[PDB]
Amino acid sequence: LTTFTFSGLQDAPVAALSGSIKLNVAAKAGKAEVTVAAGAAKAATQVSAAALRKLSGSKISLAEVARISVLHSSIQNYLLSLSNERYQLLSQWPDFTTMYGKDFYYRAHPEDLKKFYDAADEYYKLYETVTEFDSLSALASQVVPNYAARRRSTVHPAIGSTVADGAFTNFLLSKQ
Amino acid sequence: PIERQTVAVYAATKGFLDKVRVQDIVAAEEAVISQVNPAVFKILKANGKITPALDAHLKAELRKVKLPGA
Amino acid sequence: DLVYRTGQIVNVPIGPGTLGRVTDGLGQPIDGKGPLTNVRSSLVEVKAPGIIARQSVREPLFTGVKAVDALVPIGRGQRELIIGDRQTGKTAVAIDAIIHQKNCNEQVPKAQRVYCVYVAVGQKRSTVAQLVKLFTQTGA
Amino acid sequence: AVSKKEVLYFLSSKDAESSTAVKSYLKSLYAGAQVEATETDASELIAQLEKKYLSAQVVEPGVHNIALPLGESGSAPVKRYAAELFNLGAQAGFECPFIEVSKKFGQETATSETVKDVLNKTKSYVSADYNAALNEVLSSVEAEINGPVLFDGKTEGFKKFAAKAKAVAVSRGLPADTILAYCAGSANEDAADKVSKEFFTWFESAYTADAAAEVKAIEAEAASILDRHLAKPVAQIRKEQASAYASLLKRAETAKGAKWAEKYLEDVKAVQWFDASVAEAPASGPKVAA
Amino acid sequence: YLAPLRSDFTEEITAPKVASASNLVNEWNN
Amino acid sequence: ADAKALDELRKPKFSSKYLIQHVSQKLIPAVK
Amino acid sequence: ENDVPAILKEIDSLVSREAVSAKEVSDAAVALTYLQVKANRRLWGKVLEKAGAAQDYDAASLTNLLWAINTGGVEHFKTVAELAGPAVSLLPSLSPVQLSIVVEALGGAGVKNYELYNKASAVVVSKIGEFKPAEIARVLYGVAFGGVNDVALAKAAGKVFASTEVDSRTAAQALYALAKLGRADKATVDALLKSFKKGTESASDAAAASFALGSLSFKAEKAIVDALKASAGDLAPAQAVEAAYGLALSGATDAEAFKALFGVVAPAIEKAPDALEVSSLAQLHVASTISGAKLPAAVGSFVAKAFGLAADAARLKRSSAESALVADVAAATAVAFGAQYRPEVASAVASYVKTAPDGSVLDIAITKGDAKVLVQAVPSSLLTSTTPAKPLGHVAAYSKVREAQGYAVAVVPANEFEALPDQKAKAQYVLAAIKKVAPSF
Amino acid sequence: CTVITAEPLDKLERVELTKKAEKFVDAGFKLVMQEKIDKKLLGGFVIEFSDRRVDMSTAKKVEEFNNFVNKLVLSI
């Protein structure tokens, strides 16, 4: 945000848009009767037109408290988001334990039953590793250091090929 | 490894591998390295010598072995 | 043509960064894995260590070849000739000394581990690529 | 403490540990300490070198504070990600990426008067897809006069090469007339205003496509790393990672007294605070001082 | 969770090397 | 031990910044 | 029954649930500004966390949210800059009174979105009569602070500010937008300057017109100055600095206006000296010098070092087309003072680089006994963006601080210096400019 | 001799250069000179004596600087 801000009590929101919280402002020429109602609680104060202008004087400047970093947490959130797409297809696995009875054991070929008991031991291998979510935070650290070295470019952190080709067209198609 | 070399040379120089056909001494010692105790190699590697507490204890453990033909 | 002197007697990169790498006759790597990191250039023609810098060769180098370690055993600090005709197994005695050191280096403390160097002079490049394939597969 | 050229580089920086080194320096300068006279020394090659290692101390914590827009839909997470790296360039002393890579061209080719050498030591900075599509036009125009095309501009042997390289620049998609008419300029401020609004329409579609190509490679790397990891049994995973975690601790523990190693193990202690502060109240999160 | 620290620069300006689609949605559907 | 700060919790943790500082403190005094 | 902290807990439980929509996160933000909740930062953090998560966004809830972010003074760049995705998709769906709040909030936060401001200025010039004068200033504040030097809008806004006279807060936003664009149009600044003796109600718009006049270097207003001297308790210490800096640069010397402004910033720096930016501590030392109104003994000595700090930091991070200009002007200063050969000019410009008294480094600092001159190159970033192209007010800021250090600053601007064809013409341009300031040389 | 420079010399660039160059002849020898130009050099000069050359040009001082700091960051 800048140093001086020019908004407050002019072209303001007059009312809430939801029903979860009920806002009612009553603007006079000088001050305003706001009435807020959220849940069981209610509040109603008087906000001057020069009381909202002092609000943006000292800025809040929110910042994220991350376990490791904001970069790492965004890679780990993507690996958690990718593990969800693989967990959703282990959700659609047929219930093999409905065929564990001995009327399926003895009607079945002895080699097609050992394949069935191996395909059930395989699902527990796949499912116990897709729910190993404490391993996603160390897979995110295999993505970070190679990315962070591409950002330590000697040209610019935000440089890429399309810009650097577009600035070769300016460099080459001008005089020497 | 050097401990399985000297055990196999012990099995040939202490007369444990005559009564064995000369064509399959190659396959006879493959039993001898694998059928004696895997703990008797560790003592010979740690000592570096076949001690008096081991040269009988291994040559009496080179009798509880199954050799081809015999 | 203009030939410039470099001021330096012939040198090669020495150090632990040469381990695992396939270099040429002047130490430049030919395995295609970039420059030799963690390395230092030293002369190739050094005066050999004299009488007062030696001590007696007492500890064994195990070849792993039992015709060798029983009959013609090799101490550490001893030059041993492998002489024979062609295709009699001279490399196989030498390769088995290198492969066996890998098996022994996993069991000994850090002070007594043997780091092999194989110099392949005048051989085929296919023969050398078969040896670094064997040494990668064995772990040597 | 900081060496007073770092703290001049951390004034416009906005990460945490650089600003707390600034704020404890400005608190020393409130208690009457003398601001040390900065050096009018360190000639041009040394000044370019320590600027490179001071910008990389503003860029390196700043890159770790920029959330990648992985798996997002739309252009505004990619335009946010690009704009955070623009501001990280400006905070670290870089100019615009157009002005930074063009300075890289004219510095690398200050000795060249032929085009085949200009297209050869600006090889690291342009696409090989674009370096080849200019070397095809160059070796046809040098197969037309049978003399090397000069980097002169007033030579007509360059003029019909530059008229064909302009046809290559549209064949990539680059508006070659728009880019040229921005970095040249115009007299009136109204006719140069309409060419800046269509350069910046190219430029924003240019740097979005470099950020979005960077996101699509992190997305593809992470999906490749995960699918290699989802094919492992769990006992392999926990000991592959505990081996990699413990090997990386002792690389920081055997490092005697180095500043990066104390800061490494201070951050392992701060991760374990984060895991412990969340265990005390998980619906709240970590405890901050309020 | 921790990474190897690296202090090196990128001198090229290249494309970022998009890796290939791993076959695991098509192996787990098999 | 609890409730550290905010400005201490905003630090990115395993950034380099101190390898970059270390190789700047042994290069610039060595190339001068 | 009037429960303000018990309604914060009822807002906290509205945004801490799982599927908060856009309207519930708009109105949670709107209710936090009307309640003035700067003290609770985590509750503002839970609202902007759900403001990025919220996917649907109609025209009314986006502008209620962006109003609340802007008015509340809460900044988080990642959240606000990704709200420019709803905005460029709702932009034909936006009211003209709503498009002014979007572009003011996204522009005032620094969102680098060229597709937004191109389409949002092309709308506001396609329907120029459809926008009231407060809305054309809000868009002008946004496109200027979003990094777009759109002078097509600054002309179309200038025709509106000439046809109708505007509110005081409307004009001071328009002055602040033209100050960052660096325009200094006499035709439109004076049309906005008459709005400031009808009575202004805020001190933030008296201080921002103060800053915008001094940055364009016009002059003080004598009712902006006298609104600022009464209501300098409404201003934050980073805002009173930019008022006193902007009054000093315009040539005001009303010392009672400066006692009011320095009565804010002095106990703030004494309470926490690291509270302000070092760019703002340097803007205090310019203001504590040109008007001459002094400061406390621990403050004015402290902001004197922070002019030395903030001047090297802009010299270390020099634009490298400014580094070309300084080494070009210093070479012409070698030829003007007598050096016809290259080993002479190479060893002369290494003698022009003496250190300033505050610890700084001056680039072309010539010393002849007691009289010292200083040559100042003013590239293009410190020029106005208009066709006369006089330098901005910040170069007279840097001049008067060095002039109060024993120098005689000769200004060499690159619009005049680089229209010259050879080095001999550029030598007598520098030699005339040095002798115009101290003719002892 | 042969001196190769970047652009043609001054009359003071001539006089400062012999003071460099008669410290490359190891007795009471006199150098004549022969002046050539090459903008592949970025200033400085190359003195060629037909049996030795000495390159105090800054175009090689760049490369001798770069390879010193490309060797030293790999040693840290």
Ligand SMILES: Nc1ncnc2c1ncn2[C@@H]1O[C@H](COP(=O)(O)OP(=O)(O)OP(=O)(O)O)[C@@H](O)[C@H]1O
């Ligand atoms: N101990 C062994 N047991 C079985 N086969 C062996 C043995 N040693 C070598 N051979 C085989 O004999 C062949 C010759 O071996 P090797 O290549 O080691 O000989 P060489 O002395 O290196 O010959 P050259 O270098 O002249 O080609 C190889 O193909 C190898 O497979």
Ligand SMILES: [Mg+2]
């Ligand atoms: Mg052989």
